[PDB]
RNA sequence: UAUACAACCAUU
């Protein structure tokens, strides 16, 4: 099996050269040197310097040697790994820019010779693109080269017949929302609006959704299907200038890829297909399904009354068969003795509900089937204002109008998922993993603020605890205090549920641990644990099919490619630390199984381990996540 | 929003 990894063959050392110019301020001297070399120079109070790989590097202009200073320094990769990686990244960027590639944020390099206008839309250019990342595998350095495509307007924004919602800047590589382009003045979003001085440096960037929106997604899909493999194969010639640091003809090639078999245990059978839950019923149910209805108006009710009758007045409809198949003891639509109805109104303008005696006295698990007239752009008010004793279960009016069985089946599955006394399934390989506490960590720093969210689950997918903190002051010491506090809370929840400490604690991190790792290491404890870095955005891929495969890079680094009906995307898993009695291989398998310990619906599966999936989702919104995460 | 899907993500 091929991987898009390429071995870097250069001296593992960085050279720092110095220059001095008396006629010019050091910052300006460094800026001009950076511009002409496509490589950033740094400045001091008097000296300007550059850190380069220990390779032949001809600086521009030629006569710059007249400013060269005697001072030189050599830093081994041993003494400073990050400096070597930073320097190599900047060196790769320079080579691409020197060959007239455009740079785009994320180390995406847009080719300007491998460009063709789309047959479907004359005003759109399809630029062959390569995204480049640096990997440290088995004490050696590698370079992942992912062929992809960038669709840009052929003409600058003001001179482009077609338009989009995002502008790509040719110089900076950053993208900004497109506010307006009228009367020769182009305005971008920075929430600051700014008129631009060179609007010619801005092109329209077309995403997968715009291509659908502007009617050329068919050609966009075709290009991606059997014209990206040519991108993998065009690497040696198109990227030949990279011969300086690697041999593009020596590809990365028995038992370093294992297929993980996930079997679901239902009540009356087992399967590899989550959708067989309707064949063999919830692993645990015997619970009543209780529900009431909320409509945005009397009119909306009458618009869907026929479907409402077909679904809920026929006690043998697909809705009732789904609930029976999933193992619900009964289906009950509660009715207010006053109004004698199970149907109520909500204000679609304010997303509010009038509190009543009947609604207020509702106890236990009761689903609120809330009919939405259309997809709501800001659903936070609906969640925020809804009565907290009801389980909010919104559904689009149009999907009740047409009644596709798999949708109604999925809807009933979600309801079961949101009843804590239910368990749709347990994983066959997770049945003996109750002793472990699986924790996901989403922590970002942006301003001078910090955003934190943690989520803990057990071997069955039950959510033990979720903690979230908004707008913390960016300070390593303060942030790690709160981290410890939330971690202790999740720990106590496990004990609270299992009356014993977890024997092992899995800490899965969204990205890499950049905090004081030793501080974390100590307070994580007398409990055995493992520290795991998860990268949902890994650049390592292949033209081969790796879906549902786990690939070993080195002793502590794996990549799994979860099942998906979209493009093949990888998830990197790195065991930073481990003092559990599990081997790395066993830990990696448990992390992969965590992607299946719960389902939103049986027809799709999660890509990230469930605790991390929760942590990302809860951190993303103030209230919307309550629609997806049963907590 | 039954799922899913959302722009990028070491110069001015």
- Nucleic strand B within 7 A of Cβ A379: yes
User: What is the spatial distance between Cα A459 and Cα A474, in angstroms, rounded to a whole number?
Assistant: 34
Torsion angle in degrees (nearest 10) through CA of A143, A146, A149, A152: -30
Alpha helices in A148-228 (DSSP H): 208-213, 217-226
Beta bridge partners of A88: none
Distances (CA, A) of A227 to A238, A278, A285: 15, 40, 49
CB of A286 closer than 8 Å to CB of A336:
no
CB of A307 closer than 8 Å to CB of A323:
no
- Nucleic strand B within 7 A of Cβ A624: yes
User: What is the spatial distance between Cα A297 and Cα A228, in angstroms, rounded to a whole number?
Assistant: 50
CB of A252 closer than 8 Å to CB of A5:
yes
State this model's resolution in angstroms. 1.9
Residue closest to sugar C1' of B9 by CA: A106
Beta bridge partners of A279: none
Alpha helices in A41-179 (DSSP H): 81-98
Is A276 known to sit in a ligand binding site? no
**Cα A228 from chain centroid?**
22
User: What is the spatial distance between Cα A426 and Cα A461, in angstroms, rounded to a whole number?
Assistant: 8
Q: At what angle do helices A405-417 and A318-326 cross, to 10 degrees?
A: 40
Q: Which of residues 58-97 of A touch strand B (CB under 7 A)?
A: 82, 85-86, 89-90, 93
**Cα A49 from chain centroid?**
38
- Nucleic strand B within 7 A of Cβ A197: yes
Beta bridge partners of A3: A252
Distances (CA, A) of A97 to A9, A91, A192, A244, A504: 21, 10, 30, 15, 49
Of A414, A410, A334, A412, nearest to A626 by C-alpha is: A414
User: What is the spatial distance between Cα A573 and Cα A132, in angstroms, rounded to a whole number?
Assistant: 19
Alpha helices in A2-136 (DSSP H): 26-37, 81-98
φ, ψ at A66 (rounded to 5°): -65, -20
| A230: Cβ contacts below 8 Å, ≥ 6 apart | none
User: What is the spatial distance between Cα A456 and Cα A464, in angstroms, rounded to a whole number?
Assistant: 5
What is the enclosing helix (H) or strand (E) of A533?
A: strand A528-535
CB of A48 closer than 8 Å to CB of A30:
yes
Q: Which of residues 108-127 of A touch strand B (CB under 7 A)?
A: 108
Residue closest to sugar C1' of B2 by CA: A411
Active site residues of A: 442, 476, 510, 616
- Nucleic strand B within 7 A of Cβ A631: no
End-to-end Cα, chain A, rounded Å: 42
Tokens of A502: 């977890």
Beta bridge partners of A21: none
- Nucleic strand B within 7 A of Cβ A470: no
User: What is the spatial distance between Cα A254 and Cα A303, in angstroms, rounded to a whole number?
Assistant: 60
User: What is the spatial distance between Cα A536 and Cα A552, in angstroms, rounded to a whole number?
Assistant: 16
Q: Helix or strand or coil: residue A627?
A: helix
User: What is the spatial distance between Cα A391 and Cα A291, in angstroms, rounded to a whole number?
Assistant: 9
- The whole-number Å distance from A146's CA to B9's C1' is 16
φ, ψ at A385 (rounded to 5°): -95, -10
The nucleotides of chain B lying under 7 Å from a protein CB are 1-12
- The whole-number Å distance from A172's CA to B12's C1' is 10
What is the enclosing helix (H) or strand (E) of A451?
A: strand A449-457
The structure was resolved experimentally with: X-ray
Of A90, A57, A70, A62, nearest to A20 by C-alpha is: A70
Tokens of A182: 């009228």
A548: alpha, beta or left? (left if phi > 0; alpha if psi -120 to 50): left
- Nucleic strand B within 7 A of Cβ A179: no
Buried/exposed code over A467-493 (b: 16+ C-beta within 10 A; e: otherwise):
bbbeebeeeeeebbebbeebbebbbeb
Q: Helix or strand or coil: residue A182?
A: strand
Residue closest to sugar C1' of B8 by CA: A105
User: What is the spatial distance between Cα A475 and Cα A2, in angstroms, rounded to a whole number?
Assistant: 43
Q: Which nucleotide is nearest to A107 (CA to C1')?
A: B9
What is the enclosing helix (H) or strand (E) of A302?
A: helix A298-303
User: What is the spatial distance between Cα A292 and Cα A347, in angstroms, rounded to a whole number?
Assistant: 16
Residue closest to sugar C1' of B5 by CA: A209
φ, ψ at A599 (rounded to 5°): -130, 140
Q: Which nucleotide is nearest to A374 (CA to C1')?
A: B1
- Nucleic strand B within 7 A of Cβ A376: yes
**Cα A65 from chain centroid?**
47
Q: Which long-range contacts (CB under 8 A, 24 or more apart) does A353-358 make?
A: A353/A294, A353/A385, A353/A386, A353/A387, A355/A387
Tokens of A443: 């922590």
Is A526 known to sit in a ligand binding site? no
Beta bridge partners of A289: A331
Q: Helix or strand or coil: residue A403?
A: coil
Q: Which of residues 439-468 of A touch strand B (CB under 7 A)?
A: none
- Nucleic strand B within 7 A of Cβ A309: no
CB of A544 closer than 8 Å to CB of A561:
no
Buried/exposed code over A136-146 (b: 16+ C-beta within 10 A; e: otherwise):
bbeeebbbbbb
- The whole-number Å distance from A336's CA to B7's C1' is 48
Beta bridge partners of A169: A202
- The whole-number Å distance from A558's CA to B4's C1' is 26
Is A540 buried (19+), middle (13-18) or exposed (0-12) by CB count in 10 A?
A: buried
User: What is the spatial distance between Cα A36 and Cα A354, in angstroms, rounded to a whole number?
Assistant: 67
Q: Which nucleotide is nearest to A565 (CA to C1')?
A: B4
User: What is the spatial distance between Cα A154 and Cα A159, in angstroms, rounded to a whole number?
Assistant: 9
- Nucleic strand B within 7 A of Cβ A194: yes
- The whole-number Å distance from A401's CA to B1's C1' is 15
Is A616 known to sit in a ligand binding site? yes
- Nucleic strand B within 7 A of Cβ A604: yes
User: What is the spatial distance between Cα A584 and Cα A98, in angstroms, rounded to a whole number?
Assistant: 43
């Amino acid at each position: 099996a091929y991987l898009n990894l390429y071995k870097i063959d250069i001296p593992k050392k960085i050279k720092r050269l110095y220059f001095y110019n008396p006629d010019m301020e050091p910052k300006l001297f460094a800026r001009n040197l950076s511009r002409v070399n496509n490589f950033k120079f740094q400045d001091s109070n008097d000296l300007v310097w550059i850190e380069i790989p220990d390779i032949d590097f001809q600086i521009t202009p030629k006569n710059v040697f007249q400013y060269k200073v005697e001072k030189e320094e050599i830093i081994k990769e041993e003494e400073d790994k990050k400096l070597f990686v930073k320097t190599l990244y900047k060196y790769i960027k320079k080579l691409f820019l020197d060959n007239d590639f455009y740079f785009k944020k994320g180390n995406n390099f847009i080719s300007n010779s491998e460009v063709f206008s789309l047959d479907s839309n004359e005003n759109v250019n399809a630029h062959l693109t390569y995204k480049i990342k640096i990997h440290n595998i088995s004490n050696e350095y590698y370079l992942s080269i992912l062929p992809k495509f960038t669709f840009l307007s052929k003409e600058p924004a003001l001179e482009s017949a077609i338009k989009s919602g995002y502008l790509y800047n040719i110089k900076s590589g950053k993208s900004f929302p497109y506010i307006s382009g009228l009367d020769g003045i182009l305005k971008i979003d920075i929430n600051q609006i700014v008129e631009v001085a060179y609007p010619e440096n801005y092109l329209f960037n077309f995403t997968t959704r715009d291509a659908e929106k502007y009617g050329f997604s068919k050609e966009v899909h075709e290009i991606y299907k059997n014209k990206v493999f040519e991108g993998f194969k065009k690497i040696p010639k198109t990227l030949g200038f990279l011969n300086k640091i690697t041999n593009l003809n020596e590809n990365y090639q028995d038992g370093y890829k294992i297929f993980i078999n996930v079997i679901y245990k239902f009540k009356n059978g087992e399967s590899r297909y989550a959708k067989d839950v309707f064949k063999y019923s919830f692993y645990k149910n015997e619970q009543p399904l209780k529900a009431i209805f909320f409509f945005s108006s009397k009119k909306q009710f009458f618009e869907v009354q026929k479907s409402l009758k077909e679904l809920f007045h026929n006690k043998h409809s697909v809705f009732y068969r789904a609930a029976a198949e999933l193992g619900f003891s009964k289906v009950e639509f509660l009715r207010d003795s006053k109004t004698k109805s199970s149907a109520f109104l909500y204000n679609p303008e304010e997303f509010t509900v009038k509190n009543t005696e009947f609604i207020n006295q509702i106890e236990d698990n009761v689903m609120a089937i809330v009919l939405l007239d259309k997809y709501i752009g800001n659903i936070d008010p609906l969640v925020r204002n809804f009565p907290d004793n009801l389980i909010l279960q919104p559904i689009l009016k149009e999907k009740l109008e047409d009644i596709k069985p798999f949708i109604i089946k999925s809807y009933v599955y979600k309801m079961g998922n949101f009843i804590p006394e239910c368990k749709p399934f347990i994983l066959k390989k997770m049945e003996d993993k109750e002793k472990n506490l699986y924790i996901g960590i989403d922590l970002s720093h942006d301003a001078r603020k910090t955003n934190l969210c943690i989520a803990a689950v057990d071997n069955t997918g039950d959510i033990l605890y979720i903690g979230k903190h908004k707008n913390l002051e960016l300070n390593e010491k303060m942030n790690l205090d709160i981290l410890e506090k939330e971690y202790i809370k999740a720990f106590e929840k496990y004990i609270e549920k299992f009356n014993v400490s977890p024997e092992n604690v899995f800490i899965l991190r969204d990205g890499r641990f950049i905090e004081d790792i030793e501080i974390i290491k100590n307070f994580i404890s007398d409990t055995k644990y493992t520290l795991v870095e998860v990268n949902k955005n890994t650049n390592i891929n292949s033209y081969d099919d790796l879906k549902e495969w786990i690939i070993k890079l080195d002793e502590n680094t794996y990549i799994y490619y979860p099942k998906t009906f979209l493009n093949q995307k990888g998830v990197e898993v790195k065991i930073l630390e481990n003092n559990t009695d599990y081997t790395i291989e066993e830990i990696i398998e448990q992390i992969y199984l965590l992607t299946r310990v719960a389902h939103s619906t049986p027809y799709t599966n999660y890509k990230l381990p469930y605790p991390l999936h929760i942590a990302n989702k809860v951190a993303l919104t103030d209230y919307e996540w309550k629609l997806y995460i049963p907590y």
